[PDB]
């Protein structure tokens, strides 16, 4: 019994991380952002908004190591969630936010848009197992662990049920160049060359002007796309959007 539309921001209005858009900066850390963003949302969902924390992309990006991939050169969503269950992740906010244990260290930049920040350019930061000044508790006690991590089947209904019951998920899809230009509506690949793989947070679904879609958060800042979000065609494994969905359930802090 699933609704025709669902938006995690409306279901869990006291979980501000669900509404928050991040910026990977000049670093291919999308695999880590999709993970920590979904984990942040699920911790809040799991505690009915009694715990709301930004889980540190910095901690995952820099401390997972080779099991997750190659840092700013790209990585793997499934192993990000596994690292969360084995070693946990500390808190950390946006660049220069002074939020949490290890806030993001890569400065924001413009991702295929004209803006006020430097344009994004072509190096993974070192793993620092120590929190930033003024933050407590210590890095060891700030860790949040997952109970498990799992793949969701390549099935529209299965993915919808997973989001409906357990919160936002991480997914992956093929980026073609016409995606770069997205502003509004439901994206479908119509033109442009293949560019590579991208990992994102899926937080809902709906139908817009007859087209079924997934509601997705990009990590290219809020001046990209639809205030940082996009919608992509749902139900056809379009660009592989339904083929690499991963999630997991938090441990209680
Ligand atoms: C995030 C995607 S992005 O930066 O938004 C982007 C970049 C280019 C084209 C489209 C989108 C990163 C970028 C990785 C990258 C860095 C530098 C040059 C080229 C690419 N992408 C990833 O982390 C992806 C995630 C992924 C995993 C599995 C399936 C689909 C997507 N992984 C990735 O690109 N990797 C895997 C690890 N390997 C060592 C490097 C390539």
Author numbering: 0 to 121, 124 to 254
What does the paper say about this structure?
The entry of SARS-CoV-2 depends on two distinctive pathways, cell surface entry and endosomal entry, where the transmembrane serine protease, TMPRSS2, and endosomal cysteine proteases cathepsin L/B (CTSL/CTSB) cleave the viral spike protein. The crystal structures of TMPRSS2 and CTSL/CTSB in complex with the potent inhibitors were determined to reveal their specific mode of interaction.
As a result, two inhibitors, K777 and E64d were identified with an IC50 value of 5.43 and 88.85 nM for CTSL, and 174.30 and 244.26 nM for CTSB. In the structure of CTSL in complex with K777, this compound was found in the active site cleft. The density for K777 is connected to Cys25, evidence of a covalent bond. The sulfonyl group is located in the oxyanion hole formed by the side chains of Gln19, Trp189, and His163 and the main chain of Cys25, whose function is to stabilize the carbonyl oxygen of the substrate at the tetrahedral intermediate stage of proteolysis. In addition, K777 forms three hydrogen bonds with the backbone amides of Gly68 and Asp162. The phenyl sulfone, phenethyl, benzyl and N-methyl piperazine moieties of K777 insert into the S1'-S3 subsites, forming hydrophobic interactions which further stabilize the inhibitor. In the structure of CTSB in complex with K777, a comparable interaction pattern was also observed by the corresponding conserved residues except for the loss of one hydrogen bond in the oxyanion hole and the formation of one extra hydrogen bond with the main chain of Gly198 mediated by an ordered water molecule.
